[PDB]
Amino acid sequence: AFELPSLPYAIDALEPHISKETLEFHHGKHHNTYVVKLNGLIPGTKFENKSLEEIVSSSDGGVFNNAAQIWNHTFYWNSLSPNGGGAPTGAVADAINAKWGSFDAFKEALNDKAVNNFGSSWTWLVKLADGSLDIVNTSNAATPLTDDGVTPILTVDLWEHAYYIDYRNVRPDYLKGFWSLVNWEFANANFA
């Protein structure tokens, strides 16, 4: 059975960019719920003996929604860090310059894609088969994990539950918080 992974930091380690209350609800309730739901759905199908990744890449309906959300949220927590934020570094910093010319241009590009991602969704930084970086948006539970030759490197949850408590309807403010927490170490690990 799948388990809710531990948060990689203290529930108040992302303050004041993402509050303790948001973390307890988002990770403690929302993330957990997907875990419970998936476990409830798999026994009795050809999924109970497969990994989360295998499942997301071979399912649909409720099995996929819950499984993918589990994967998406775990990737999301890793994309944040009390030690992140600021300018990118290492491989990813240069890759960002290679694609967009500058970190700033990349930042405005991603913010534009995220603020305009309609409804419940996710905005991703991915590495394409050609080796370049790019920004893609997914709806609901969809994820680039299912795109062949596409490697997820960083993600930002744009479902309203991810920011409503701290920023209400202002995604731009939420995004400023995201840039203050972005985990470049996780990005680079995923990049290399």
Ligand X SMILES: OC[C@H]1O[C@H](O[C@H]2O[C@H](CO)[C@@H](O)[C@H](O)[C@H]2O)[C@H](O)[C@@H](O)[C@@H]1O
44 binds, among Fe ion, ligand X, its own copies, none (CB under 5 to 8 A by kind): none
Establish if 174 lies at the interface with Fe ion (CB under 5 A).
Answer: no
Establish if 159 lies at the interface with Fe ion (CB under 5 A).
Answer: yes
| 27 labelled binding-site residue | no
| 157 labelled binding-site residue | yes
137 binds, among ligand X, its own copies, Fe ion, none (CB under 5 to 8 A by kind): ligand X
Residue of 1, 124, 127, 6 whose CA lies nearest to 52: 1
Establish if 164 lies at the interface with its own copies (CB under 8 A).
Answer: yes
Establish if 160 lies at the interface with its own copies (CB under 8 A).
Answer: yes
| 30 labelled binding-site residue | no
22 binds, among its own copies, ligand X, Fe ion, none (CB under 5 to 8 A by kind): none
Question: Residue 98 or residue 170: which is nearer to its own copies going by CB?
Answer: 170
Q: What is the dihedral of CA 72, 84, 163, 144, to 10 degrees?
A: -20
How many other C-beta atoms are found inside a 10 Å radius of the C-beta of residue 97? 15
Q: What is the DSSP letter of 168?
A: T
* Min separation Cβ 113 and ligand X, Å: 6
Sign of CA dihedral 99, 100, 102, 107: negative
Cα 17 from chain centroid?
Answer: 16
The SS3 of residue 40 is helix
Residue from 65, 78, 143, 183 in contact with ligand X (CB under 6 A)? 65
CA 7/CA 39 separation, integer angstroms: 20
What is the phi/psi pair of residue 183, to 5°? Answer: -90, 90
Residue from 161, 172, 176, 192 in contact with its own copies (CB under 8 A)? 161
CA 77/CA 87 separation, integer angstroms: 19
Establish if 115 lies at the interface with its own copies (CB under 8 A).
Answer: no
At a CB cut-off of 8 Å and minimum separation 6, what does 46 contact? Answer: none
Binding-site residues for Fe cation sit at 26, 73, 157, 161
Binding-site residues sit at 26, 73, 157, 161
By the criterion CB under 6 A, which residues form the site for ligand X? Answer: 61-62, 65, 116-119, 121, 137, 139
By the criterion CB under 5 A, which residues form the site for Fe ion? Answer: 157, 159, 162
